[PDB]
Design a protein around this ligand. Structure first.
Ligand SMILES: [Ca+2]
Lengths: 802, 155, 126
């Protein structure tokens, strides 16, 4: 016959006992045995019974107990016929707890790549086993989720296959909190996509210098420099939305790179929350010209910055960075005349120069410092001011009719600045590899922070949650299309609601015009910017008027509940807090770009012009420019690790991973999954496994057998659906078809066991009654004798027969 | 329920034959009654017998005709298996569908799963019914499910 | 048949009223009264001899039958049942044996290695 399995696939991807030759345990105990959730540990295997009221009083393996639980905390978890799988979507009992173990069971059972629909959950074993090699690679031409177990080469080879094939353009979202290797895959692939990109001339190999894949993550530190690497509640958050947008040929060939950005934490520079250190590089830099000017090392002063920690050493980032440069677009006429341009910021950080005893005006005061930047940057520490502290609006008619500004005018420039001059890095960085000759289209790997809900929530948090949330729904929608069809590709179909559009509710809470976005935005020009003014106002509706969101509620973790209202997306609800928000939407816009023009230094000129508002403004234009740039493509999702803080490559950390999944979209993936008709099986894979269920209820085809087995069971017609090749069941009905089978098989064995011990008695019958006669004779007979040898007319019957 | 006189009859006639093999005194030990009904046609299960008296220890409780008779009326009902039913059990074990089962595995079911059959049995049973292996060392359950159901006396 | 109608020598008038024996049977042991002739309702004769006497042979089987009766519990034609088996087939089966009936039975009932021989037993029990 056959199919296939193993061999070696000795990643191991391999096989703990190839399963059903030696198993142990079947009867299971499914009304009994599945896990309670607690907390130490998350949930845990167990037994059940109490029939209490009311909770329980049963428990786990190992340990245990006399413990009380209820019904929202019980859960249950898949008969062994639902042990360590792949699609995970194909999984009766799609509960929060259940999930996990099919992954824990991958670490402690060496393996860490599972599907959950499209989601390519994958872990960091960070021991670097033979996984990525070539007694591995060597295949998947267009092999799909099912023509090869997990690994990303799927997302690789069939986002790939989807490429060429299909037609249009790919994409792909990468998630993973600050751990795994996102720095890779995004890195570990390419190697792939490329191997298979030019293995469809240039032999000399001399063009094989900067390598491919392991090249553009070269620039990394000039990018990732500005870039990123070190924040506060984590430490290497490339604080920008990347997108290794590499381009694709017209002939199923590669065809370049490309790459942009979205949301660069302007803020980061002007404001900061201490350990909330601003961008790895300033320090990783502050010999031969380690001066060439202006102050040098240690915060103390130089604000907009006002310090490193473990094996961070800002050392090498430097010297060991200068040159990498020199392979692309620049001959030390920029490379060099572009750092000052950096240092040219720290200066303003040298705050103050006052107001007026009372007169609303501001003083030019200091300006002994401004000079330098008016020397670094260009122009002259006087070129400005006026049209910087009291300018003239342009039909001409120059005017000058505030102090509180400037600081903003700065805590705006430094931003705007730093902003422009990154777009810059990009501009060229890719140039070298930007053979923009153009040969249509490409894949795309995306990257951006991933929704953070914790201890405190500010105008910072609310932004990502504004990103991801809106991000997600792109996913949902997508999935609303891969089902939308299918049923369609399966004769069945049951119109539903674009789940993706259940989140909108919340995306359409802020982005929404009279959403909050604008009631926060505008409310910056507004001179009466109390914050409180802001507070209630957002109300003056919303609170009791939206549906989605709330007022705080109460405590959760350490410290108390010094909250400030609650907002909720997927990934639960979040307790944000405004305060310094209006103070910080802060970015306003000049007067000759408030100058920067010419200076005969375009290093600071052709980074300006080739008004007076805030950051959200420009955010949404980025974001959308990221959505209305995404919603027209072929998504893909890959998620990451976060096994255990102290990198014990061994395994786990439920809550820590539970944490995650409670984002990405996975948990939200079963939420919707669990909403429709998961659990899928072509009838053949059913007939078999489920025939004991109506044995005497079949004639003795496939799609026919299966029906009597459904009909014979009184199965609720709403729990199932019969397309036309396979049958979809409600959320975990397959379970019941394992509570029954499992139990309605034992009842078949015994019925036999017993049909074969009636056969032994019904066999011994005559042998048995014969026995009686033969026995009732001995007794009778022993007694007739023994009755005799003690009678008398016998006893002395022939003491001598005469 | 509601025996007849060609039915209620072969009962006492058996109850009798079984009341004597534990001492003729007008009664029958429970335990040994599950083996009364077997001979009497029906194929009740352990649980089945227990759930009407059928002790575990021989000599724990002994039923007199009447007091016994009733509990016989209710064993008839009990889910008496069937080909298709039986036939499946061996199939969910037929990792081939070819219609076989390594005697190994086979003697595993009858022994391990469900109501364990005395390891005393089986060999016994497979040995009158005669269940000869064959080349591979496996059996063709089918002819066996039939054989066992055919009773010890065929045609 | 008539190896029956014999005797009448050694016993004691005409049909020997009382104490046929006594004179006739103390020449060797230490004899018994008036029951060994109280249980002689009769009286005497040869009349209902075949009646009262004998016919007390009811159920009394052939020594080929009883021997066979045993055979059904040892058809490995070993011509032997293991003690316990019998010791149990009698004490707890059919019309079970009283601790005494039993005590007597297995008195000179031949056994060896725990192996009873019904194939003599009969012979000795007639
Ligand atoms: Ca009895």
């Amino acid at each position: 016959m056959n199919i296939d399995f193993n061999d070696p696939d000795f990643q191991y991807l391999a096989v703990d006992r190839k399963k059903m030759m030696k198993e142990q345990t079947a009867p299971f105990d499914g009304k009994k045995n599945c896990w309670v959730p607690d907390p130490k540990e998350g949930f845990a295997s167990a037994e059940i019974q109490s029939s209490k009221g009311e909770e329980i009083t049963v428990k786990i393996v190992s340990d245990n107990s006399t413990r009380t639980v209820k019904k929202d905390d019980i859960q249950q978890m898949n008969p062994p016929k639902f042990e360590k799988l792949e699609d995970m979507a194909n999984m009766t009992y799609l509960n929060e707890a259940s999930v996990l173990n099919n992954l824990r069971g991958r670490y402690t059972a060496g393996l860490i790549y599972t599907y959950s629909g499209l989601f390519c959950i994958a872990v960091n074993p960070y021991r670097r086993l033979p996984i990525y090699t070539d007694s591995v690679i060597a295949k998947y031409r267009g092999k799909r989720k099912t023509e090869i177990p997990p690994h990303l080469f799927s997302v690789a080879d069939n986002a790939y296959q989807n490429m060429v094939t299909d037609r249009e353009n790919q994409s792909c979202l990468i998630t993973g909190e600050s751990g795994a290797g996102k720095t890779e895959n995004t890195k570990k692939v390419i190697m792939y996509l490329a191997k298979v990109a030019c293995a469809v001339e240039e032999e000399e190999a001399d063009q094989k210098k900067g390598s491919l894949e392991d090249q553009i993550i070269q620039a990394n530190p000039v990018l990732e420099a500005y870039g990123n690497a070190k924040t506060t509640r984590n430490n290497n958050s490339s604080r920008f939305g990347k997108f290794i947008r590499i381009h694709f040929g017209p002939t199923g060939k590669i065809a370049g790179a490309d790459i942009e950005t979205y949301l660069l934490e302007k803020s980061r520079v002007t404001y900061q929350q201490s350990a909330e250190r601003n961008y790895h590089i300033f320090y990783q830099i502050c010999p031969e010209l380690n001066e060439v000017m202006l102050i040098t090392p240690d915060s103390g002063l130089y604000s907009f910055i006002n310090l490193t920690v473990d094996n961070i050493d800002d050392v090498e980032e430097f010297k060991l960075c200068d040159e990498a440069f020199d392979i692309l677009g620049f001959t030390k006429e920029e490379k060099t005349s572009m750092f000052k341009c950096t240092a040219s910021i720290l200066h303003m950080g040298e705050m103050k120069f006052k107001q007026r005893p009372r007169e609303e005006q501001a003083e030019s005061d200091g300006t002994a410092e401004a000079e330098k930047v008016a020397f670094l940057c260009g122009i002259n520490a006087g070129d400005l001011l006026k049209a910087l502290l009291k300018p003239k609006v342009k039909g001409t008619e120059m005017v000058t009719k505030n102090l509180q500004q400037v600081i903003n005018s700065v805590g705006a420039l430094s931003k705007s600045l730093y902003d422009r001059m990154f777009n810059w890095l990009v501009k060229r960085v890719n140039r070298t590899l930007d053979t923009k000759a153009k040969r249509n289209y490409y894949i795309g790997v995306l990257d951006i922070a991933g929704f953070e809900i914790f201890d405190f929530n500010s105008f910072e948090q609310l932004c990502i949650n504004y990103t991801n949330e809106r991000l997600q729904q792109f996913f949902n929608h997508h999935m609303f299309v891969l089902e939308q069809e299918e049923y369609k590709k399966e004769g069945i179909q049951w119109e539903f609601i674009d789940f993706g559009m259940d989140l909108q509710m919340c995306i359409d809470l802020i982005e929404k015009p009279m959403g909050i976005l604008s009631i926060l935005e505008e409310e910056c020009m507004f001179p009466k910017a109390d914050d409180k003014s802001f507070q209630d106002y957002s109300y003056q509706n919303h609170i009791g008027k939206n549906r989605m969101f709330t007022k705080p509620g109460k405590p959760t973790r350490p410290n108390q509940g010094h909250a400030h209202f609650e907002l909720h997306h997927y990934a639960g609800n979040v307790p944000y807090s405004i305060a310094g928000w209006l103070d910080k939407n802060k970015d306003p816009i000049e007067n000759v770009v408030s100058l920067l023009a010419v200076s005969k230094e375009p290093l600071v000129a052709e980074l300006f012009r080739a008004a007076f508002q805030t950051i959200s403004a420009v955010h949404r234009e980025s974001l959308n420019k990221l959505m209305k740039n995404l919603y027209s493509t072929h998504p893909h999702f890959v998620r990451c690790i976060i096994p255990n803080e102290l990198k014990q490559p061994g395994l786990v950390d439920a809550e820590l991973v539970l944490h995650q999944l409670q984002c990405n979209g996975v948990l939200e993936g079963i939420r919707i999954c669990r909403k429709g008709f998961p659990s899928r099986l072509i009838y053949s894979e059913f007939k078999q496994r489920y025939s004991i269920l109506a044995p005497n209820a079949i004639p003795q085809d496939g799609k026919t057998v299966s029906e009597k087995i459904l009909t014979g069971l009184q199965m609720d017609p709403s729990e199932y659906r019969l397309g036309t090749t396979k049958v979809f069941f409600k959320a975990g009905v397959l379970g019941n078809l394992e509570e029954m089978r499992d139990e309605r098989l034992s009842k078949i064995i015994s019925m036999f066991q017993a049909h074969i011990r009636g056969y032994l008695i019904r066999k011994a019958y005559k042998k048995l009654q014969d026995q009686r006669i033969g026995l009732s004779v001995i007794q009778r007979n022993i007694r007739k004798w023994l009755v005799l040898r003690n009678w008398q007319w016998w006893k002395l019957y022939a003491k001598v027969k005469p | 329920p509601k025996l007849s006189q060609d039915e209620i009859d072969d009962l006492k006639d058996v109850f009798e034959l079984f009341d004597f093999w534990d001492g003729r005194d007008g009664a029958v030990d429970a335990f040994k009654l599950g083996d009364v009904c077997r001979c009497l046609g029906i194929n009740p299960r352990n649980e089945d017998v227990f759930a009407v008296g059928g002790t575990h220890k021989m000599g724990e409780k002994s039923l007199p005709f009447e007091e016994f008779l009733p509990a016989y009326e209710g064993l008839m009902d009990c889910e008496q298996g069937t080909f298709a039913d039986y036939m499946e059990a061996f199939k969910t074990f037929d990792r081939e569908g070819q219609g076989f089962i390594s005697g190994a595995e086979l003697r595993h079911v009858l022994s391990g799963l469900g109501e364990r059959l005395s390891d005393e049995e089986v060999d016994e049973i497979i040995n009158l019914t005669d269940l000869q292996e064959d080349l591979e060392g496996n059996v063709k359950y089918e002819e066996f499910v039939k054989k066992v159901m055919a009773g010890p006396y065929p045609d | 048949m008539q190896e029956m109608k014999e005797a009448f020598t050694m016993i004691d008038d005409g049909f020997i009223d009382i104490n046929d024996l006594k004179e006739e049977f103390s020449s060797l042991g230490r004899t018994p009264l008036t029951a060994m002739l109280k249980e002689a309702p009769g009286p005497l004769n040869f009349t209902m001899f075949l009646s009262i006497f004998s016919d007390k042979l009811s159920g009394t089987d052939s020594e080929e039958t009883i021997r066979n009766a045993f055979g059904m519990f040892d058809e490995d034609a070993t011509k032997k049942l293991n003690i316990e088996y019998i010791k149990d087939l009698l004490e707890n089966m059919g019309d079970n044996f009283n601790k005494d009936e039993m005590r007597m039975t297995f008195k000179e009932a031949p056994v060896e290695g725990g192996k009873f021989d019904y194939v003599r037993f009969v012979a000795m029990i007639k």
